[PDB]
Amino acid sequence: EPTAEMLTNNCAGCHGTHGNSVGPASPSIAQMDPMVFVEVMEGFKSGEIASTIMGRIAKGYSTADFEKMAGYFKQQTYQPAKQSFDTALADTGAKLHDKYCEKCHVEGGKPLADEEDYHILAGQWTPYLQYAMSDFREERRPMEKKMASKLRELLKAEGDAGLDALFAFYASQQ
Amino acid sequence: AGRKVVVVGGGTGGATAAKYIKLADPSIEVTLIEPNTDYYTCYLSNEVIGGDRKLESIKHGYDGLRAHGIQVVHDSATGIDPDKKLVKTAGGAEFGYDRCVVAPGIELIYDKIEGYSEEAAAKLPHAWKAGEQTAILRKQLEDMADGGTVVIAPPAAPFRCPPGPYERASQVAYYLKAHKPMSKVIILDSSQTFSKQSQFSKGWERLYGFGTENAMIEWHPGPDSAVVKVDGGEMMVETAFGDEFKADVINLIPPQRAGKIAQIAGLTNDAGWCPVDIKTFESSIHKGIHVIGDASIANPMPKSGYSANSQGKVAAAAVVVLLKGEEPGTPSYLNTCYSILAPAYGISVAAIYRPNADGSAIESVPDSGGVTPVDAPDWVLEREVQYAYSWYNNIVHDTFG
Ligand SMILES: *Cc1cc2c(cc1C)nc1c(=O)[nH]c(=O)nc-1n2C[C@@H](O)[C@@H](O)[C@@H](O)COP(=O)(O)OP(=O)(O)OC[C@H]1O[C@@H](n2cnc3c(N)ncnc32)[C@H](O)[C@@H]1O
Ligand code: HEC
Ligand code: HEC
């Protein structure tokens, strides 16, 4: 069976050498919580998380390969995607992030290698995160009940301007 | 250790094997022989032809991997003959290699279509290598008279990135609209069916007219319609069933085989492609040379940039560890070829492969891969274009580095 690095070689095509994607829209998957990785990857595989292609990709690997692979991605250092955020909005993002997301999205949603569990969002490519949210609000992706509430009702006390502000803030974190 | 590995060819495949080797253990001096300055991509050139991408965007230097510990000697290889492990190049240099990676690309075979020549290329262009060639075709589409008809002529059998002709027809059709729903793309093909056909047809229906025949693309099947052995600067092509198609811009895409140096060296077989061992890409003909993806026979791995990259890795790893250590291991290879049909409409085919059982035999892992479902929603088609670009930006960075 191939080494973790053999299997991870073949993903450099779409999200960077080591998982750090260059522009403009693929997600960087470099520092990734190995637990979150098999969940997502096996989710992609089952079809429950709507993909454009990762269900096709994922379906050819199996749990242990997702483990070898998450083992492989965990040791890399994530590199923030240098892109343009909104200054006027960078700020408001922070505030709203505390008040609604900070509960689970660890310190600006940064890749904290704080042993286990975290959802990387700082320095991730904005188009992706925009898509990410779309699959949520539209119910294409399973969404945890608290993750929802804060988003689904609460964030929207700000409306879409809210999400804009959040997208600008995660992008400032470079 | 202080080893010399010579890599002949420094395009996607060659470059990938070069850097990843140097990268894999920096004491090996890796010299990369390539006739030229710049690598013009071809995997997103049809967007230049469609008019959305400047030619500037697909040009790329060796400065990256060079300044990474690879000696980029710009020269064409001329001979290679093993035994006394030497490599000679059109100007007097012979480099000794402990192992060599030959990655030459496709030789296009003009002969096969009587009328076409190396010098016909400049007027009736196959932009199946890019650069200059892509510019010619773009000038011709900018120069066409509104009403002008463009024909595109796929070879058949094995060629490089199969959806290529049809994404070109989509990109061209995308542009032609600049000349009023008044123009036409005519594809005279050598095959009954083709890659991502139903998705291509659904796309075409949706965007450029297609069942409508008040439609901007026309697809004419094959072998009949295979544009054979005649075309002339009377601006006519003649298919194998003798019809004459007069068109203002014709793009003939000639049959292809392993690049010339693979033939001089002795690496090609009966088909004119090089037999490799599937685990390490070493040639089944001459030992110590590893040939990668285009010029090599890799079971269902389509001749693509992606496949080149993957194989490049299996090669890089295969030689470096085999080079100075012990028994390399098992690999997994992957491919996905992306096709953008209109700025908002994109499709893809993707696949995962594994050494099926034992020995030479690359077979796709069952139940995986596929191409954008025909019933794909708006978001998928819209997203895929962006993921196509992302794939480009990433793979040209993974590769030259
Ligand atoms: C042209 C085309 C191909 C496509 C494509 C669309 C078009 C119009 N679309 C693709 C896509 O969307 N996705 C892909 O994954 N690939 C696409 N491709 C395929 C194609 O571009 C790749 O297969 C190809 O570029 C990679 O193949 P390769 O690595 O085997 O070869 P190369 O052309 O990249 O470079 C080979 C290299 O060798 C040099 N050379 C030749 N002969 C010598 C000698 N004597 N010594 C030294 N150098 C030598 C040659 O000049 C070239 O640079
Ligand atoms: C391009 C053809 C891809 C290849 C090859 C691989 N991935 Fe991928 N990945 C790609 C895209 C476009 C996306 C977005 C999802 C979609 O299909 O719409 C992703 C995403 C991931 C993720 C999710 C990351 C996140 O932020 O949630 C993971 C876990 C991931 N990809 C892993 C992965 C691995 C391990 C691969 C190599 C075997 C791989 N991908 C290949 C595009 C492509
Ligand atoms: C705690 C529970 C929360 C809260 C309060 C929010 N999120 Fe986050 N989020 C959470 C989980 C467990 C997951 C994984 C998916 C699942 O529910 O099974 C996520 C994921 C995200 C993502 C996608 C990440 C990716 O795969 O790349 C995003 C973009 C995201 N969450 C954003 C986000 C924002 C903006 C929130 C505040 C309104 C928010 N989450 C709250 C768990 C939780």
Beta bridge partners of B94: B88
Q: Ligand 2: does its nearest atom lie under 6 Å from the Cβ of A169? A: no
A83 & A147 share domain: yes
Find the residue in A nearest to B337 (Cα): A13
What distance lies between CA B124 and its chain's CA centroid?
Answer: 19
Ligand 1 binding pocket includes B11 (Cβ within 6 Å): yes
A122 and A166 belong to one structural domain = yes
Integer Cα distance of B209 and B186 in angstroms: 13
Residues B277, A87: Cα–Cα separation, whole Å: 55
Q: Is B312 in the pocket of ligand 1 (CB under 6 A)?
A: no
A117 lies in the same domain as A51: no
Peptide bond preceding B155 in cis form (omega within 30 of 0): no
Backbone angles phi, psi at B82, to 5 degrees: -60, -110
Token readout for B281 is 């890409």
- For residues B323 and B3, the answer to whether their CB atoms sit within 8 Å is yes
**Contact B105/B128 with Cβ under 8 angstroms?**
no
Separation of alpha carbons B154 and B138, rounded Å: 18
Distance between CA B210 and CA A18 in Å, rounded? 43
Measured at the CA of A36, the angle between CA A30 and CA A38, to 5 degrees, comes to: 95
Regarding whether A61 and A116 lie in a shared domain, the answer is no
Collect all residues of chain B within an 8 Å Cβ-Cβ radius of residue A24.
386, 389-390, 393
Pick from B240, B220, B236, B246: nearest CA to B228: B240
Q: Tell me the CA distances in angstroms from B368 to A109, B303, B332, B341, B363, one per residue in order.
A: 33, 19, 13, 24, 11
The two three-digit tokens of residue A42, written as one number: 């096996």
B87, containing H or E segment? strand B86-89
Cβ partners under 8 Å of residue B217, min gap 6: B169, B170, B173, B184, B185, B187, B204, B208, B209, B210
Same domain, residue pair A149 and A168: yes
**Checking DSSP bridges between strand B150-153 and strand B185-188, what pairing results, if any?**
parallel
Indicate if A135 and A153 belong to the same structural domain.
Answer: yes
| Residue A153: other Cβ atoms inside 10 A | 9
Name the nearest CA neighbour of B229 among B115, B119, B120, B122.
Answer: B115
Q: What is the atom index within ligand 2 of the atom nearest the CA of A131?
A: 18
Distances, alpha carbon A74 to alpha carbons A54, A78, A79, B106, B315, in Å: 19, 9, 13, 39, 26
Of the CA atoms within 13 Å of residue B246, those in its CB half-sphere come to 2
Determine how β-strand B227-232 pairs with β-strand B236-239.
antiparallel
Exposed/middle/buried for residue A4 (C-beta within 10 Å: 0-12, 13-18, 19+): middle
Closest by CA position to B252, among listed B138, B344, B131, B126: B126
How many other CB atoms are found less than 10 A from the CB of residue B391?
26
- Give the tokens for residue A29: 């998957």
Give the ranges where B25-76 is alpha helix by DSSP (H). Answer: 46-50, 63-66
Residues of B in contact with A25 (CB under 8 A): 383, 386-387, 389-390
On whether the CB atoms of residues B380 and B345 are closer than 8 A, the answer is no
What is the 3-class SS of B285-309, one letter each residue? CCCCEEECCCCEECCCCCCCHHHHH
Among residues A47, A78, A109, the one where a domain terminates is A78
How far apart (Å, rounded) are the C-alpha atoms in residues B126 and B108? 9
Q: Which domain holds residue A119?
A: 79-174
CA distance B273 to B203: 34
What are the residues whose beta carbons fall under 8 Å from the beta carbon of B377, sequence distance 6 or more? none
What is the C-alpha to C-alpha distance for residues B380 and B373, in angstroms, rounded to an integer?
9
Is A119 marked as binding a ligand? no
CB B328 within 8 A of CB B318: yes
Would you state the structure tokens that stand for residue B183, as one six-digit string?
Answer: 């123009």
Q: How far is CA A8 from CA A42, B182, B363, in A?
A: 16, 48, 19
User: Which residues touch A106 (CB under 8 Å, ≥6 apart)?
Assistant: A112, A114, A118, A119
Tokens of A33: 């919580």
- State whether residue A138 is helix, strand or coil: coil
Nearest alpha-carbon partner for B300 in B399, B395, B195? B195
Assign B311 to helix, strand or coil: helix
Shortest CA distance to B186 belongs to which of B146, B227, B157? B227
The amino acid at residue A10 is N
CB-nearest to A59 from B306, B317, B367 is: B367
Instruction: Give me the CATH number covering residue A170.
Output: 1.10.760.10
DSSP of B372-401: --TT--HHHHHHHHHHHHHHHHHHHHHHH-
- The C-alpha of A98 sits at a distance from chain B's nearest C-alpha, in angstroms, of 30
Domain count, chain A: 2
- Residues whose CB is less than 8 angstroms from the CB of residue B62 and which lie 6 or more positions away in sequence, other chains included: B10, B15, B32, B34, B39, B70, B72, B400
Query: Does ligand 3 have an atom closer than 6 angstroms to the CB of A15?
Result: no
Residue among B365, B372, B386 whose CB faces A24 most closely: B386
Considering only CB atoms, which chain B residues are within 8 Å of A46? none
Q: Which residue carries 């035994």 as its tokens?
A: B83
Best of A20, A21, A53 to mutate (most B CBs within 10 Å, chain B): A53
Q: What is the 3-state secondary structure (H, E, C) of A31-87?
A: CCCHHHHHHHHHHHHHCCCCCCCHHHHHCCCCHHHHHHHHHHHHCCCCCCCCCCCCH
Cis link prior to A24 (omega < 30° from 0)? yes
- Rounded Cα–Cα distance for residues B383 and A25 (Å): 9
Query: Cβ of B363: how many Cβ atoms within 10 Å?
Result: 12
**Resolution at which this structure was determined, Å:** 2.5
Q: Any CB–CB contact under 8 A between A7 and chain B?
A: yes
Residue with tokens 């479902």: B373
Q: A10, B348: Cβ pair inside 8 Å?
A: no
Of B332, B334, B387, the CB nearest to A25: B387
- To the nearest 10°, report the CA torsion of B313, B314, B316, B322: 160
Q: Which of A15, A33, A147 has most ligand 3 atoms within 8 Å of its beta carbon, as the pocket-test mutant?
A: A147
Residues A17 and A90 occupy one common structural domain:
no
The CA distance from B267 to B139, in Å, is: 38
Distance of CA B285 to the CA centre of its chain: 24
Give the separation between CA A57 and CA A40, rounded to whole angstroms.
13
Residues A74 and A89 in one domain: no
**Structure obtained using:** X-ray
Q: Do A26 and B390 touch (CB under 8 A)?
A: yes
The answer to whether B41 is a known ligand-binding residue is: yes
By DSSP bridging, strand B217-220 and strand B296-297 are unpaired
Per DSSP, A154 falls in state I
Q: Which residues contact B33 (CB under 8 A, 6 or more apart)?
A: B6, B7, B8, B9, B10, B73, B75, B76, B77, B87, B89, B95
Distances (CA, A) of B72 to A161, B18, B62, B185, B210: 51, 10, 7, 41, 48
Residues A70 and A90 occupy one common structural domain: no
Q: How far is A56 from chain B (nearest CA, A)?
A: 4
Q: What are residue A19's DSSP bridge partners?
A: none
B386 in Cβ contact with A127 (< 8 Å): yes
Q: DSSP 3-state assignment of A12?
A: helix
Residues of B at the A interface, defined by Cβ within 8 angstroms: 306, 309-310, 313-314, 317, 329-334, 336, 348, 350-352, 364-365, 367-370, 372, 379-380, 383-384, 386-387, 389-391, 393-395, 397-398, 401
Of A78, A110, A125, which residue sits at a domain end? A78
Cα distance between residue A76 and residue A30, in whole Å: 5
CA of B129 to the centre of ligand 1 (A): 7
Does residue A58 sit in the same domain as residue A95? no
Number of the ligand 1 atom closest to the C-alpha atom of B90? 45
Residues in A 37-96 with any Cβ partner in B closer than 8 A: 52-53, 56-57, 59-61
- A74 neighbors A66 (Cβ within 8 angstroms): no
**Shared domain check, A153 and A114:** yes
> DSSP characters for B241-269?
T--EEE-SEEEE---EEE-HHHHHHT---
Residue of A5, A8, A9, A79 best to disrupt the B interface, most CBs of B under 10 A: A9
Out of A7, A9, A25, the one facing B390 most closely (by C-beta) is A25
B212-245: burial string, b at 16+ Cβ within 10 Å, e else: eeebbbbbbebeebbbbebbeeebebbbbeeeeb
* Same domain, residue pair A128 and A93: yes
Mapped onto helix, strand or coil, the DSSP state of residue B197 is: helix
Walk me through the domains of chain B, giving residue ranges and CATH numbers: 1-116+256-327 (3.50.50.60), 117-255 (3.50.50.60), 328-401 (3.90.760.10)
Strands (E), B159-283: 185-188, 217-220, 227-232, 236-239, 244-246, 249-252, 256-258, 274-275
Q: Which of A78, A113, A135 is the last residue of a domain?
A: A78
Residues in chain A: 174
Which residues fall within 8 angstroms of residue A120, CB to CB, at 6 or more apart?
A31, A32, A33, A78, A109, A110, A111
Which residues in chain A are immediately followed by a break of C to N over 2.5 Å? none
CA of B197 to the centre of ligand 1 (A): 24
